[PDB]
Ligand binder design. Structure first.
Ligand SMILES: [K+]
Ligand SMILES: [Mg+2]
Ligand SMILES: [Mg+2]
Ligand SMILES: [Mg+2]
Ligand SMILES: [Mg+2]
Ligand SMILES: [Mg+2]
Ligand SMILES: [Mg+2]
Ligand SMILES: [Mg+2]
Ligand SMILES: [Mg+2]
Ligand SMILES: [Mg+2]
Ligand SMILES: [Mg+2]
Ligand SMILES: [Mg+2]
Lengths: 244, 32, 97, 205, 124, 95, 37, 46
RNA sequence: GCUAAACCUAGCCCCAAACCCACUCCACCUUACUACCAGACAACCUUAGCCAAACCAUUUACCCAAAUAAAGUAUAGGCGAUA
């Protein structure tokens, strides 16, 4: 036989049933959106049309991203979108020679970063690209908030984003409790990234984490039927008195 | 017997439901 | 042995039932209906065979392209193998080159 | 009780009997008998009904239905549509020949009008009180459901309570006073069992 | 050569296997040093048998009993038959408050009770 | 030769034939002589002139190349200022 | 950062379609490693 | 010498090698159970 | 004359349509189907090859989501096979 829906649509159907239905709309739209990551291991053409050198004709060109493998240890650091490149090479760059397996690994470094919003220092494994992105963003706090989810390529980076967004959303007074003037200055510096606290709590959460969080919010002890029946009995007696 | 009514092209524009996943993507764009 | 000893039950065919009496009706829907509907639109069956004909290889290619994502995993695997065998048979085996 | 095979063929002998097991062993697989589907509300033949045979040797004769087999749309009329067979046959004795009734389909019998003893068609209709009864089509007369002995072989009128049969007064006595206590709690109070030790909390997972 | 389809019971296997497998009977104690078994009196179930002297109910019921419609007991029926008269009596008198729901039979918590409805801590 | 393609179910064209031969619409095929650019110093001018000629193919070769190319290459083309336009049709041909 | 490009040209996929990648598209040649800049 | 008696029965070895717990100890063994469940095997493991 | 022979059903196949399925009690990841004791072990990671090229070594179609058409065209390729 045949399935009513295509197989690749089964995942999206599951989001319309069960506990995933009751997830916040703003969170669900984030999962549906799939932006193209900033090119890292390949150079984009930069133009939609190029003149072919041979026939001298205008031919459409497209950017095909290089597949990237992110090791699980990359989720505990900030690699800046870099990852392992699992591919093939030709010996001596000659197509008539053997096709060998080649893996390109980023050079990882251990660095300590201070977050102004979080008022804490983190020892994060980063690459040289991550340092450049932070330098171009003028600070770690700007880099975390500005960089999209698809470009961070790190669960820890998204967790840092949620922490910063929560403090900005709440105007949390735990940041320098004894210096109210200094606390307001930092919040004013990053006021452009402020979002409502309801949305900030769901930023960076995976589907499994969101489901568990939603389940806990909806988890409540059932109301005993004694209390429910008392309310109906009391209401009905009042209505009887009015008719009399 | 009597023949069934002839199959006719249904009058009026056909607007697919945008909220249906089985709706083809080409029937939802501005070009359609 | 190998042949039945009794006559089979007689075949009763209603030559004038509704299906046979109205067979072929509206086959000229395009000619007599201002070409609003093509006669191929009357064909009912698999979605990959309405108004289209081909050999076994062309049917297998077309079915995989149109409803391949909706097929079962075991059915899809057999279809993929059938295309591979038919590709080798038609393009590599035969009396004529 | 017994889980019959998917295509078990019901016969005159009741299922699970000695004769049925010999005729229908667990390994038998015969062609199913095509039976016209009749709804329970549409069925109109019951034990004790008087019907007239339409086809067969006893066409036009009337008799009393003694058994109905819904799985085959069969009605058995006592002493009608009968063939003769030997019973109790042994090696020395040829046996005793007795008339044996053959089953009749529902379309081969027709219910009779109580006022005029002739076959007639009936339809299920509701009376003013709301009861569902059978009404003759041509005459519009109510045909009562015949009084047949119960399948358990018990006559309420000719019934005497035994040494282990609860009397009607005791059986229908209502001694239950509703309360928010379990059976265990009420028995502890009734029998005076005292338990002061408290139950310790346990982990459920 | 082993029979996979047969039920795995305590009669199969070496001596260690046979002594560890049971037949579903509940334990009534524990083993101390020297393989000595200590039987706990409280772990042994106690049969609460009532006095049947002067009991008018017999295993069977006489067939001269009128047929009655089956009405399964529900929470709504139990509340009406047991709690509604108590609440209605106090409602007319004008003395009814949510604080005294325990007076009518409501139990806020099952902890501290010998027989707890949920989780169940008593046998049938 | 691919008689039935795996993606479209159609006959494919051997592109080696296209890069070497020109098919006139009359059915003829035009080719260049093999080795007309090889070792010209050891070849007489009479021989070299024959190598520079554009020759036709016989019936077997023409039929072979027809099977190796699809119907797209057998259509009638109206290229502007086509050098081989006059050779696409036959004149005064009997039998 | 290691930057590579494919030896084999990837056929165009069109508007709103993901490119079809054969196993020969896994072959890469090193363009430039940014650490040597 | 004479062959054919390569199977020397032992319940301890049989349960430790092809048991239900042994099957679930590795991801490959879990797939073994899943294949037998899919095929409808009456005995998923020893 | 035996041995046998004969049968018409059980059901199934391909499509359409429509998005399926889990738990009476009790038992079941330890030696599964075992009432009742200190865990902290935890998932990710390029398919290869037969085969075709009449050897083989680069290479050799494999649903990726609109039927048709552009088109087996542009293009790729021991510019070979073929893609
Ligand atoms: K061939
Ligand atoms: Mg065996
Ligand atoms: Mg297109
Ligand atoms: Mg693809
Ligand atoms: Mg053996
Ligand atoms: Mg040994
Ligand atoms: Mg099966
Ligand atoms: Mg089970
Ligand atoms: Mg070969
Ligand atoms: Mg060889
Ligand atoms: Mg070329
Ligand atoms: Mg060749």
């Amino acid at each position: 036989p045949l399935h009513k829906y295509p197989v690749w649509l089964w995942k999206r159907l599951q989001l319309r049933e069960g506990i995933c239905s009751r997830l916040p709309g703003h969170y669900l739209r984030s999962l549906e959106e799939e932006r193209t990551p900033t090119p890292v291991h390949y150079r984009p053409h930069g133009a939609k049309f190029k003149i072919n050198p041979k026939n001298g004709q205008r031919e459409r060109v497209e950017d095909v991203p290089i597949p990237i493998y992110f090791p699980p240890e990359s989720q505990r650091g900030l690699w800046g979108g870099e990852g392992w490149i699992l591919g093939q090479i030709y010996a001596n760059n000659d197509k008539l020679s053997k096709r060998l397996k080649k893996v390109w690994k980023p050079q990882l470094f251990e660095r300590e970063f201070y977050s102004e919003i979080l008022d804490k220092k983190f020892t994060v494994t980063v690459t040289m690209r991550t340092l450049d992105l932070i330098d171009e963003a003028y600070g770690l706090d700007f880099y975390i908030l500005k960089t999209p989810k698809e470009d961070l390529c790190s669960k820890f980076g998204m967790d840092l984003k949620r922490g910063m967004l929560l403090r900005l959303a709440r105007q949390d007074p735990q940041l320098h409790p004894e210096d109210p003037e200094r606390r307001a200055a930092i919040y004013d510096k990053y006021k452009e990234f402020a979002i409502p606290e309801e949305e900030a709590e769901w930023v960076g959460l995976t589907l499994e984490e969101a489901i568990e969080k939603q389940r806990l919010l909806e988890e409540k002890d059932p109301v005993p039927l004694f209390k429910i029946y008392v309310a109906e009995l009391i209401q009905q007696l009042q209505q009887q008195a009015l008719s009399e | 017997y009597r023949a069934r009514p002839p199959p006719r092209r249904r009058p009026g524009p056909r607007w697919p439901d945008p909220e249906d996943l089985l709706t083809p993507r080409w029937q939802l764009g501005p070009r359609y | 042995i190998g042949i039945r000893l009794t006559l089979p039950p007689p075949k009763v065919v209603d030559r004038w039932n509704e299906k046979r009496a109205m067979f072929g009706v509206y086959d000229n829907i395009g000619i007599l209906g201002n070409f609003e509907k093509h006669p191929k639109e009357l064909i009912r069956g698999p979605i990959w065979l309405r108004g289209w004909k081909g050999n076994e290889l062309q049917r297998c290619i077309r079915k995989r392209k149109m409803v391949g994502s909706r097929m079962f995993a075991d059915d899809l695997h057999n279809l993929n193998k059938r295309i591979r065998y038919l590709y080798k048979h038609f393009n590599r085996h035969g009396k004529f080159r | 009780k017994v889980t019959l095979p998917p295509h078990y063929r019901y016969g005159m002998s009741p299922p699970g009997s000695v004769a049925d097991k010999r005729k229908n062993p667990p390994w038998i697989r015969r062609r199913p008998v095509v039976v016209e589907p009749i709804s329970d509300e549409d069925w109109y033949l019951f034990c004790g009904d008087t019907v007239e045979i339409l086809e067969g040797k006893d066409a036009g004769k009337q008799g009393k239905v003694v058994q109905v087999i819904r799985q085959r749309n069969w009605v058995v009329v006592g002493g009608l549509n009968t063939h003769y067979r030997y019973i109790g046959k042994t090696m020395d004795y040829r046996g005793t020949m007795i008339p044996s009734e053959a089953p009749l389909l529902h379309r081969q019998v027709k219910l009779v009008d109580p006022m005029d003893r002739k076959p007639t068609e009936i339809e299920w209709r509701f009376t003013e009180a709301g009861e569902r009864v059978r009404v003759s089509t041509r005459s519009g007369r109510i045909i009562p459901k015949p009084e047949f002995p119960r399948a358990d072989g018990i006559v309420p009128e000719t019934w005497i309570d035994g040494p282990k049969d609860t009397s009607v007064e005791d059986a229908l006595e209502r001694t239950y006073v509703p309360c928010l206590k379990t059976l265990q709690e009420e028995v502890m109070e009734a029998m005076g069992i005292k338990e002061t030790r408290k139950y310790k909390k346990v982990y459920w997972y | 050569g082993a029979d996979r389809m047969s039920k795995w019971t305590s009669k199969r296997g070496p001596r260690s296997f046979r002594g560890r497998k049971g037949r579903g009977a509940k334990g009534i104690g524990f083993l101390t040093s020297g393989w000595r078994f200590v039987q706990i009196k409280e772990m042994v179930p106690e049969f609460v048998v009532p006095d049947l002297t002067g009991f008018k109910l017999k295993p069977y019921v006489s067939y001269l009993a009128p047929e009655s419609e089956e009405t399964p007991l529900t929470a709504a029926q139990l509340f009406s038959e047991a709690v509604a008269p108590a609440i209605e009596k106090d409602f007319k008198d004008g003395t009814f408050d949510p604080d005294n729901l325990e007076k009518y039979g409501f139990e806020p918590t099952q902890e501290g009770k010998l027989f707890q409805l949920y989780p169940r801590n008593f046998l049938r | 030769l691919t008689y039935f393609s795996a993606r479209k179910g159609k006959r494919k064209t051997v592109k080696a034939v296209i890069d070497r031969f020109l098919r006139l619409h009359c059915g003829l095929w035009v080719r260049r002589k093999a080795g007309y650019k090889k070792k010209l110093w050891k070849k007489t001018p009479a021989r070299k002139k024959r190598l520079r000629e554009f020759v036709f193919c016989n019936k077997t070769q023409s039929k072979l190349l027809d099977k190796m190319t699809t119907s797209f290459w057998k259509r009638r083309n109206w290229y502007v200022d086509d050098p081989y336009q006059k050779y696409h049709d036959r004149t005064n041909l009997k039998v | 950062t290691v930057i590579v490009e494919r030896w084999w040209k990837v056929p165009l996929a069109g508007e709103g379609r993901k490119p079809r990648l054969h196993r020969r598209h896994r072959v890469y040649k090193l363009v430039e490693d940014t650490k040597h800049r | 010498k004479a062959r054919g008696n390569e199977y020397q029965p032992s319940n301890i070895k049989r349960k430790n090698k092809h048991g239900w717990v042994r099957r679930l100890s590795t991801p490959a063994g879990v797939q073994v159970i899943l294949r037998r469940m899919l095929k409808g095997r009456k005995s998923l493991s020893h």
